[PDB]
Design a protein around this ligand. Sequence first.
Ligand SMILES: CC(C)(COP(=O)(O)OP(=O)(O)OC[C@H]1O[C@@H](n2cnc3c(N)ncnc32)[C@H](O)[C@@H]1OP(=O)(O)O)[C@@H](O)C(=O)NCCC(=O)NCCS
Ligand SMILES: CCCCCCCCCC(=O)OC[C@H]1O[C@@H](O)[C@H](N)[C@@H](O)[C@@H]1O
Length: 323
Amino acid sequence: MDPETVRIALGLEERTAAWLTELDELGPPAEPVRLPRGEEARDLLRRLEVPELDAEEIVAAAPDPDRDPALWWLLERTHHAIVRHMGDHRAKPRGGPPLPYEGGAAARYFHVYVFLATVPAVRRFHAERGIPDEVGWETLTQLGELVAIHRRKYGQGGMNMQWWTTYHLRGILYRLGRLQFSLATGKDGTPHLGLHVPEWGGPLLPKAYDESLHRARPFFDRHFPEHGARVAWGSSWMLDPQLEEYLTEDSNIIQLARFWTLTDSAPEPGNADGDSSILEFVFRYNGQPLDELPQRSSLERAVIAHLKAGRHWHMRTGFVKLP
Ligand SMILES: CC(C)(COP(=O)(O)OP(=O)(O)OC[C@H]1O[C@@H](n2cnc3c(N)ncnc32)[C@H](O)[C@@H]1OP(=O)(O)O)[C@@H](O)C(=O)NCCC(=O)NCCS
Ligand SMILES: CCCCCCCCCC(=O)OC[C@H]1O[C@@H](O)[C@H](N)[C@@H](O)[C@@H]1O
């Protein structure tokens, strides 16, 4: 097939042409793309903590090379475009565009199929790096979380966080207890670890946070000794000191943010760039009228109160030294 035919068949926008040309030049992977089917597929999806409802649907809608040629063309090359950067954190996180939902369940679940097809490759990388199996699997389970998030946010099955799963699939991100850590470099090339907080796994309890921090240096110095990070960096709505107006002393965020050293400037009060982030992570915001969002928790009430008052939330950036 040709990239223009794929683009038109799948209903992809004109801007995606450059990507599709790049995928055309890259070509199919050396190891043919294989999707698990049936109970094999159900076992893998369950291992990745995909909810039963979605997993059933994913298995049912799995595409076919003959009946879904445009989709298959893209699945092979997207897989290839990811595995070509296995272990490479300097490459940008390009998972490809979401597919228009007029293509049905196979289109909605496209990047789940990408993920499934790429599991063997990343698991081989984990093995080569000596990563324990439990850590490898624990890391890959965010697929289930992101699938669940799609359904909560939009109302039907899907997974549209494919840019983020390129981290898991390149073996450059590891879940080490409550927190995740990514191989990263600053603008000056200095190695660090990106610190991330997946939604699943309960509250950000101080003892769980501390355990994760203690795991970071030993893990990376053992399996990626060439990296040599000494510091973890975080960028998050969580680091916004404005939260102190609203959250009390029992807040995990408040207690733990106190250990962080913020490195960005106090943002302009009129800068609204951070509003969408906090709305995503607190409400999985999808354009609802604000006073029709839940108000059960102190943070839910905080986000809305602050915004109603004409004020703005900001992503802040900081670091903590690795123990
Ligand atoms: C990170 C996370 C686990 C922290 O939860 P936590 O440890 O309970 O945080 P706190 O102790 O500071 O919470 C204070 C209050 O806000 C509530 N709260 C915390 N995070 C919340 C969220 N994402 N949505 C709604 N309410 C939340 C708590 O239940 C608590 O309520 P209460 O005071 O009414 O009892 C949670 O916010 C989460 O799952 N977020 C999604 C993932 C995320 O944001 N990661 C970072 C992306 S940059
Ligand atoms: C106060 C506790 C520590 C504060 C440091 C918080 C750093 C968290 C940063 C983080 O979680 O961001 C990474 C996110 O990348 C998103 O885009 C993905 N959707 C999300 O999964 C991931 O959490």
